Amino acid sequence: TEILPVSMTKTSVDCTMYICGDSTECSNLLLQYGSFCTQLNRALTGIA
Amino acid sequence: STNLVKNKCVNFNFNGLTGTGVLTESNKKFLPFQQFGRDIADTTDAVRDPQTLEILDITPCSFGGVSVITPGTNTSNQVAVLYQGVNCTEVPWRVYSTGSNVFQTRAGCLIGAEHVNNSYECDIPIGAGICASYQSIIAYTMSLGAENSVAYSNNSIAIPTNFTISVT
Amino acid sequence: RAAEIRASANLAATKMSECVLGQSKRVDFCGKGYHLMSFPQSAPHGVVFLHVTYVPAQEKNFTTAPAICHDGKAHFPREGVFVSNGTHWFVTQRNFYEPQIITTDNTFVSGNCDVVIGIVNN
Amino acid sequence: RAAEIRASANLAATKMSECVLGQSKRVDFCGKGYHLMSFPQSAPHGVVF
Amino acid sequence: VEQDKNTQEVFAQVKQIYKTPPIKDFGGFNFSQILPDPSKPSKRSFIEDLLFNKVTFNGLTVLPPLLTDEMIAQYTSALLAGTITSGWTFGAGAALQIPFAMQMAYRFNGITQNVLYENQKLIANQFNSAIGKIQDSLSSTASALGKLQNVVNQNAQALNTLVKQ
Incomplete structure (x- = not known):
């Protein structure tokens, strides 16, 4: 009998809540990383 | 200032905008409110010169x-x-x-x-x-x-009598 | 590289393991032919694999027949095909030649010889 | 993506290789029944089976 | 170099450009677009033409494929030619002819041959119109090409976000 994973729990990440905790000063400093979390969330939605 | 030359790889200082490339004549349409151009991701793709006010386009x-x-x-x-x-x-x-x-x-x-x-x-x-x-x-x-071309017909064959064993 | 190593290792697990337990018809696996066996050897980070690649070969342009009528009925065969090597006519196989007498044991009958074009009488 | 496309290429090499050139018992990989042959095509970067 | 290795891996599967002879005579079989048309200089099938149309700097160079697309087209024409005339035995043996019409009986008897010499048209036309229907479906229906479009759009957006960076 053999046991093998076939998925994982589908997870997605709010970029700006996880990295800021709902702070306007944090997010404003965070926006100058450009297209920064669209690709993360695209990868994670792609993961999703 | 100096004189401008087209279709030869030169270096240019257009009003503080420094870049490199071959300039040629562009069929694009600048409106008079436009100052310069870019196309995708902050690369100046066409420029109208600051004096003769004619459109050129830039490729490095x-x-x-x-x-x-x-x-x-x-x-x-x-x-x-x-x-x-x-x-x-x-x-x-x-x-x-x-x-x-x-x-x-x-x-x-x-x-x-x-x-x-x-x-x-x-x-x-x-x-x-x-x-x-x-x-x-x-x-x-x-x-x-x-x-x-391996030629087919319903009424002909090609019969091997030996083998070509290849071992790799 | 390790995922590449692991994909290759699962390939390696697939290749030496099964590449020995039975006839396995997948290409790039153990032999470009009727697979029978393989022989591995170690090396500092990997393996070697010589493959068993049986090949029928050295072809020609001999002759074969679509069907043969006998006493008014057409023969479309199960095994034992109508061929010729030039002089004599036999019933043989797909891949090679091994003659048998045309018998009711090695031939099966299907339809009359009056509609199909290119039939040969015998 | 190179790993996935090469995984796709390893799949792609295999689909034309081990899904046409003989009748094995392969199913649910290439083909969906008593498989006999397949007929590929080009693409920009791909295949059709 | 591995993309060049990729392309040669996926496309150079056989050793020479095998070809079927241009006359098409098995017993009444129709599949006009699986062997491409040598009167066309493209040497490709029609679906490839629609395929080519359907899909849509500061050092981000593109280096062209070594196996460039006409040779890719010539390759796949051989791969069409490889399997439709010479059967299942050349991976067992040599790419040697054996008749396709009795190959249709054995390609059936693994699944007897009275059905083929009496109903050659019917056994053919099953595949013919059905591949005809789907090749018309390939020609007519667009948006069946998600994945290559997914690869190109993601990579173009990968390039586009790379230049957006």
């Missing part, structure tokens, strides 16, 4: 990587040089560039090599379907093989 002048085709230092010492993706007129190695034969590929241009009409199971890839070899450097059209 054509270039690529250089590759060397050398068949091994034990076999020979002669080379061929590939320039990646240039029409081989806008190069200005002056000992090689003027010489016996210089060839032009869809992936750029080849120095020190002559095109042949041959067909070979090629080995050293060039790009754009041409590939080079020592065989003095030849570059040619690669053969996939001999082209042959």
Whole structure:
């Protein structure tokens, strides 16, 4: 009998809540990383 | 200021905007409120000059990587040089560039090599379907093989009597 | 590289393991032919694999027949095909030649010989 | 993506290789029944089976 | 170099450009677009033409494929030619002819041959119109090409976010 994973729990990440905790000063400093979390969330939605 | 020249790789300071490339005449349509242009991701794709107020467009002048085709230092010492993706007129190695034969590929241009009409199971890839070899450097059209046709009919055969065992 | 190593290792697990337990018809696996066996050897980070690649070969342009009528009925065979090597006619196989007498044991009957074009009488 | 496309290429090499040139018992990989042959095509970067 | 290795791996599967002879005579079989048309200089099938149309700098060079697309087209024409005339035995043996019409009986008898010499048209036309229907479906229906479009759009956006960076 053999046991093998076939998925994982589908997870997605709010970029700006996880990295800021709902702070306007944090997010404003965070926006100058450009297209920064669209690709993360695209990868994670792609993961999703 | 100085005078401006088109269709030659130059360097330009357009009102504090420093860049490099070949300028030519553009069929685009600037409106009078426009000051300059860009197309995608902050690369100035067209500019109207600050005095004669005519539209030019900029592409940074054509270039690529250089590759060397050398068949091994034990076999020979002669080379061929590939320039990646240039029409081989806008190069200005002056000992090689003027010489016996210089060839032009869809992936750029080849120095020190002559095109042949041959067909070979090629080995050293060039790009754009041409590939080079020592065989003095030849570059040619690669053969996939001999082209042959296994002919069918309902009333003929082809019977093996031996085998060709290949062990790899 | 380790995922490439693991994909290759699962390939390696697939290749030496099964590449020995039974006839396995997948290409790039153990032999470009009727697979029978393989023989591995170690090396500092990997394996070697010589493959068993049986090949029928050295072809020609001999002759064969679509069907043969006998006493008014057409023969379309199960095994034992109508062929010729040049002089004599036999019933043989797909891949090679091994003659048998045409018998009711090695031939099966199907339809009459009056509609199909290119039939040969016998 | 190079790993996935090479995984796709390893799949792609295999689909034309081990899904046409003989009748094995392969199913649910290439083909969906008693598989006999397949007929590929070019694409920009792909295949059709 | 591995993409060049990729392309040669996926496309150079056989050793020479095998070809079927241009006359098409098995017993009444129709599949006009699986062997491409040598009167066309493209040497490709029609679906490839629609395929080519359907899909849509600061050092981000593109280096062209060594196996460039006409040779890719010539390759796949052989791969069409490889399997439709010479059967299942050349991976066992040599790419040697054996008749396709009795190959249709054995390609059936693994699944007897009275059905083929009497109903050659019917056994053919099953595949013919059905591949005809789907090749018309390939020609007519667009948006069946998600994945290559997914690869190109993701990579173009990968390039586009790379230049957006």
